[PDB]
């Protein structure tokens, strides 16, 4: 029947594969496929993603080598992944997530292939500093889709794909990440602090330099804090400078000194 607000769950492995391949491809656009299950009409699951060789034709249907795709699928079936392929992702470095004119036609072919295949656009150079610019698109054939729920407008579109047709020729589908408790705190081991890192005593000369600088900054802040309190007269009732800056300085200084003293003490008494 006619589709709806829908959803697309992509796995952690899939997302990292996509981001890594995109950051490998920049500045040349690169593309590949995701494996997944059409679990139902209201959401599509993709798990695992495999990139495919970058031909000189650029991101297009011709860039999809049938031999490479077929034998990759066969070997993944042997290795334990019988997941049948819906979805193709491509990279748009330097510009937002939207389907270009080429992308419209590639997704038209992909839709003709299965029916509900989903396009994915990743910008590997804008997806940085903790923000990931990922988005997923489907083409329309009056009424664009059925809005039978409120989980279609929990997100907001963007002007870039708006002119490029985020509702005009294609529509964006809300993206969700199906992480589980096992992948959780498996990834976390990457920033996980080690016990020796916990008992590490920093550096005493560097700590003294830090206290030296921060107390001097405290003095220079208090100098104008005095002026601020001496202009308490309430001419033209007006968060810059003295008060909250002094607050953050005292907070960081006090916590650093307390933690250094505590680590030093614990090391003194426990280590012999």
């Amino acid at each position: 029947a006619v589709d709806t607000a829908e959803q697309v769950y992509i796995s952690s492995l899939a997302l990292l594969k996509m981001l890594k391949h995109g950051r490998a491809g920049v500045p040349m656009e690169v593309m590949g496929l995701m494996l997944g299950e059409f679990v139902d009409d209201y959401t599509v699951r993709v798990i695992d993603v495999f990139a495919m060789p970058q031909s000189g034709t650029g991101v297009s249907v011709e860039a999809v080598d049938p031999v490479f795709q077929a034998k990759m699928l066969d070997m993944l079936k042997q290795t334990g992944r019988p997941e049948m392929v819906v979805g193709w992702y491509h990279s748009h470095p330097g510009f937002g997530c939207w389907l270009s004119g080429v992308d419209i036609n590639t997704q038209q072919s992909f839709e003709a292939l299965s029916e509900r295949a989903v396009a994915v656009v990743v910008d590997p150079i804008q997806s940085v500093k903790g923000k990931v610019v990922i988005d997923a698109f489907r083409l329309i054939n009056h009424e664009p889709r059925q809005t039978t729920s409120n989980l279609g407008h929990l997100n907001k579109p963007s002007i870039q794909a708006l002119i490029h047709g985020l509702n005009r020729h294609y529509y964006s589908i809300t993206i969700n990440y199906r992480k589980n408790e096992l992948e959780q705190k498996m990834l976390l081991n990457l920033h996980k602090k080690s016990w020796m890192e916990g008992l590490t005593l920093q550096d005493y000369s560097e700590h003294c330099k830090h206290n030296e600088s921060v107390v001097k900054e405290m003095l220079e802040l208090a100098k104008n804090y005095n002026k601020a309190v001496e202009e308490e007269d309430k001419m033209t009732p007006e968060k810059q400078d003295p008060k909250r800056h002094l607050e953050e300085h005292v907070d960081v200084l006090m916590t650093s000194n307390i933690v250094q003293c505590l680590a030093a003490m614990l090391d003194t008494v426990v280590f012999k």
């Binding site: 952690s12 492995l13 997302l15 990292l16 981001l19 890594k20 950051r23 590949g32 798990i47 695992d48 060789p53 490479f68 034998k71 990759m72 070997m75 042997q78 290795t79 334990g80 992944r81 590997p124 997806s127 940085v128 500093k129 903790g130 990931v132 096992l182 992948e183 498996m186 990834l187 081991n189 990457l190 920033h191 996980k192 602090k193 016990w195 020796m196 890192e197 916990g198 008992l199 005493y204 107390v215 405290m218 002094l246 607050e247 005292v250 960081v252 200084l253 006090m254 916590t255 000194n257 307390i258 250094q260 003293c261 505590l262 030093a264 003490m265 614990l266 008494v269 280590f271 012999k272």
Partner: protein, 286 residues
């Protein structure tokens, strides 16, 4: 030799996916796959890995499938997509090694002269470092002990390329604890450090129990390195060290004095202004 191996998020997520994939239907003590990486200096950086058809007998510990042609053409295609990554090492998920594993490493040495094996215990979600790394060694041991085809530990750690770093952070965001964590996270980190130190010392206890009782062979090595560790303890309460410790602690105390006193002053300044404002409102209301 090889001094360090750094392991990226992608391989560990891939092996977790492989373990869930196989254990979903074909639950088995381990799964075996191949890592891809590059060499800087004498450190190794591993970010790629694929599952290979593998099978182990239950107790014969000599019977095993690892697919030659599958490994070869899968590597060829992974080279086609990205040619930098060449075959280094092989991974498995079994929390324990097997007598059968050194044959696996010898086969892998056909594809890499110094192939390194990595145990990734996916099921454990514990104190730390879910990756263990091992190289193959064959030497006379220099001490009269019989030589043997042996696995040797090489230190390992997790490091991320920037794209994998943003990818992992975005998924961790909801459960992510803040990096700064002024007091709470630091105190919890110190407590966790004491926990880890106690756990490691108890492991060393159990090893010494097994060595004295004889059920475990004396390595001669490490145990004398452990004796060096035991002689390395600093022995605090030596007098000039006590003087220096008191001096530095007093410096920390005067600094925290200044911070606390300023905090009290600013607290009073907020209090007085709040009283003035609410009293002004009360006086205006009448």
């Amino acid at each position: 030799a090889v001094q360090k191996v750094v392991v990226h998020p992608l391989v560990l997520l891939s092996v977790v996916d492989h373990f869930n994939r196989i254990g979903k239907v074909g639950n088995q003590k381990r799964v075996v796959g191949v890592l891809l990486g590059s060499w800087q200096k004498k450190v190794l950086d591993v970010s790629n890995s694929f599952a290979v058809p593998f099978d182990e007998d239950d107790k014969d510990d000599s019977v095993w499938f690892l697919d030659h042609d599958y490994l070869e053409n899968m590597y060829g295609m992974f080279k086609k997509v990205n040619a930098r990554e060449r075959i280094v090492g092989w991974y498995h998920t079994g929390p324990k090694l097997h007598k059968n594993d050194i044959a696996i490493n010898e086969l892998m040495k056909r594809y890499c002269p110094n192939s390194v094996l990595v145990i990734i215990d996916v099921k454990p979600k514990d104190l730390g470092l879910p990756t263990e790394a091992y190289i193959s060694v064959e030497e006379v041991h220099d001490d009269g002990t019989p030589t043997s085809k042996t696995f040797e530990h090489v230190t390992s750690e997790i490091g991320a390329e920037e794209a994998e770093e943003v990818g992992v952070e975005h998924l961790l965001r909801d459960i992510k604890d803040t990096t700064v964590g002024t007091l709470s996270q630091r105190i919890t980190n110190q407590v966790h450090g004491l926990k880890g130190l106690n756990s490691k010392l108890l492991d060393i206890r159990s090893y010494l129990e097994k060595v004295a009782t004889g059920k475990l062979p004396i390595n001669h090595q490490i145990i004398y390195q452990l004796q060096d560790v035991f002689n390395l303890l600093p022995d605090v309460s030596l007098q000039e060290f006590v003087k220096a410790f008191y001096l530095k602690t007093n410096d920390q105390m005067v600094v925290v004095y200044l911070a606390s006193l300023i905090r009290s002053v600013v607290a009073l300044h907020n209090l007085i202004n709040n009283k003035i404002a609410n009293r002004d409102a009360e006086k205006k209301e009448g």
